[PDB]
RNA sequence: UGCCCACCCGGUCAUAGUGAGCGGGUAACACCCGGACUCGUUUCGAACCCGGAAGUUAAGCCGCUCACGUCAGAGGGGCCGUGGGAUCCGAGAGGGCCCGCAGCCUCUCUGAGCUGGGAUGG
RNA sequence: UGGGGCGGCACUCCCGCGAAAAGAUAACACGGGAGCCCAAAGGUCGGCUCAGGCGGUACAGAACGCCGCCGUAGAGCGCAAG
RNA sequence: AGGCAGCUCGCGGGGUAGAGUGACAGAUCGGGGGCUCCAGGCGCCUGGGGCUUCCGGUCUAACUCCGAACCCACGAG
């Protein structure tokens, strides 16, 4: 049988949360930084924040910030040879390096 | 003298009437406890439904009234003479509580009559407290108190022998 | 605690001091906060700013420096004292550079006519634009008119309100009845600098 | 002065936690005293809110000891994997060698609160 | 379509596993679901804490109401699974 | 006028082999102590059942308090 291609399929363990990270958002110090254009970020999905959540295929990728729309950011990521632009809420981002 | 802060005080003498249903008995039970205490009572909702015993969620099945300082002691002085020998050492827990039931309300040494309303039973709960218990029930910076500061069973008996001259 | 399946709450949540659900909203929206705290004897006001390593104070004000700098004589944590501390806080904040701020009640209950709303109103008169609903305090409480009426009922219980304080036995002439008159002379003193 | 000790707002979110027992305050933090007024309890000035100040270190809070928890370092013990190679072994299951990397559990011992911004005390 | 037929639907969609710790990946493989329901089971604001157990209370009983102690979730969140 | 099929360093992502079971869910073999009922024998003894507690043992494609080799994104060389 071929697999169902829902939005959150084959994510039983990617969207786990370890016992010491559970609860409504713990880390506020990452949210106190305002990314400017040209910065590098890492797309890290937060399983407990259900707004502005990216797709499984982008978890752990490194993007470049190119703009801002509201409270969410426009991030340019490479998948293969293709450029893709995402709009991600800052709860799903960490700075790179 | 820090011993003044370890004193035992009376607090929250609560009267409960459990009729076990809703309608045609609550009001007369509501009227009954209205004059025993002198304060307006409250209906008590039931917990999770059982579908037997007739209880269901949100259904008022009981009436309670809470008395505080300088009126709790007066009310206790008029219900105790009925059951002076009913109070037992086994009915005291290890945290400063004691409870006793009244089988028949007119048994009280008061001006009770037998109108067409009928007769009910009563339950009385007595809570013994020390100064500083506010730390468990305040809103901000609430904490917990150790067993060191709690009222013990042995000293709770003394508070009943004194100020009330109760037996056993 | 029982082992490897137990998760510990935040330290300020365990102490019962901070509400992190409201604090989450401020950080997302990058608010500059005006924080009117209270205690059993004083009132504390601070104007904060978010930072990675901890909040930066922009301005500060305490009720102890009402008596040590402007000759306040009444209680240090009643409604007229809440207004005066807030007025002083707004003057320091505006002089420091900020012109608007967001109220941060904390874990206090927002009751109309209370001390917390008195602090906010005092800061508004000083010139700090704090958004507020049309349901603030009452103007007869700020000057202490309600305190004087209670003192003026000394005729029955033979006791004036202001019993002598901890050290006011031989130093402070408490006069609760003439409290509103004492209010504006202090207010005019901080209004000029 | 001083530096660090509480308090207000925090960051890290158990090496920081939980329980028990003890130590410490003439200020600060609290319990505490009372309700005319703003406000309030489907009853209760208990809680919330307002006004106060006699009393106390007994609670909370801070520090210390001991039990368990947690994170590491060291030591004894149980289990054990893997990327590349060969006309290597073996009927196969599997195994050995060459070059390249490790891991998990359990006992025993030893430690265990750091830190940014502002008004009281030493 | 392990010839076709009979059967089934692996013929549209969703969850786990197959799947080899990025991505992609087949079987007439395995374990199951959807084709709706709700004017509230939707929006916001406030207060509160759940299942289970222990001590004391008339009828009261494992399980009615009241007074206390513990409880990291062992509950609940329309319906499958996560 | 730059490009990336390869490698190194830096900085991140992951839940597989293994390993555990008192860390959740299921399965699974024995012993000691305490409580209770039933049956048999002369208050005691023996057997069966249920609960609790402590000690050891066996497992998991649709278990995880853990966790390699390895693979991958980005920057520089």
Author numbering:
A (entry chain L21E): 2 to 98
B (entry chain AL5P): 8 to 175
C (entry chain L18P): 2 to 194
Could you pull the original sentences from the published paper?
The ribosome is a large macromolecular machine that synthesizes proteins in all living cells. We present 10 cryo-electron microscopy (cryo-EM) structures of the archaeal ribosome from crenarchaeota Sulfolobus acidocaldarius (Sac) at 2.7–5.7 Å resolution. tRNA and messenger RNA (mRNA) translocation through the ribosome, catalyzed by the elongation factor aEF2 in archaea (known as EF-G and eEF2 in bacteria and eukarya, respectively), is an important and complex step during translation. Moreover, the structures of archaeal 70S ribosome complexes support the idea that the mechanisms of the translation elongation process are conserved in different domains of life.
During our termination complex formation, we first incubated aRF1 with aEF1A·GTP and added them to a ribosome–tRNA–mRNA (with UAA stop codon in the A site) complex. However, after solving the 50S LSU structure from this termination complex sample, we found the density for aRF1 and E-site tRNA. In the 50S–aRF1 complex structure, only domains II and III were traced from the EM map; however, domain I—responsible for recognizing stop codon—was flexible, and no density was attributed to it. However, in the Sac aRF1–50S complex, the long helix containing the GGQ motif in domain II swings 18 Å more toward the P-site tRNA CCA end, causing a steric clash with the canonical P-site tRNA. A structural comparison showed that the GGQ motif undergoes significant conformational changes to overlap with the backbone of residues 74 and 73 of the P-site tRNA. This finding suggests that besides releasing the NPC, aRF1 can dissociate the deacylated tRNA in the P site from the 50S ribosome after translation termination. Furthermore, inspecting domain III of aRF1 showed that it binds to the L11 stalk, and the L11 stalk RNA backbone is 7.5 Å away from that in the 80S ribosome. However, in the 2.7 Å aRF1–50S structure map, H68, H69 and H71 from the starting model fit very well with the density map, indicating a conventional structural conformation in this complex. In the aRF1–50S structure, we did not find stretched H68 and H69 from the inter-subunit interface, suggesting that aRF1 binds with the 70S ribosome first and sticks to the 50S subunit after 70S ribosome dissociation.
